[PDB]
C-alpha cells in the first residue's frame, strides 16, 4: 500500500509528483497513482523510484 522513495524526483507537469528520497507515498503499470501526505498532492510516480515500506 505504502512505498518509500529511493531517489529524489522532480516533476514540472501537473500529472506527476515531486518527491524526496525517503518520502512515504500511498499507492492509489509503469507509473502509479500515489498520494503524498507530506504535500497533500495526488499524482503519478515512476515505479522504479520507489520500494515497499
Amino acid at each position: 500500500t505504502t512505498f518509500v522513495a529511493l531517489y529524489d524526483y522532480e516533476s514540472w507537469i501537473e500529472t506527476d509528483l515531486s518527491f524526496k528520497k525517503g518520502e512515504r507515498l500511498q499507492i492509489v503499470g509503469n507509473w502509479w497513482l500515489a498520494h503524498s501526505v507530506t504535500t497533500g498532492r495526488t499524482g503519478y510516480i515512476p515505479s522504479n523510484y520507489v520500494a515497499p515500506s
Binding site: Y9, N30, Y44
Partner: peptide
C-alpha cells in the same frame, strides 16, 4: 498515464 516508459534514474 500509467503505461508511459520508466524514466532514467537520477
Amino acid at each position: 498515464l500509467a503505461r508511459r516508459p520508466l524514466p532514467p534514474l537520477p
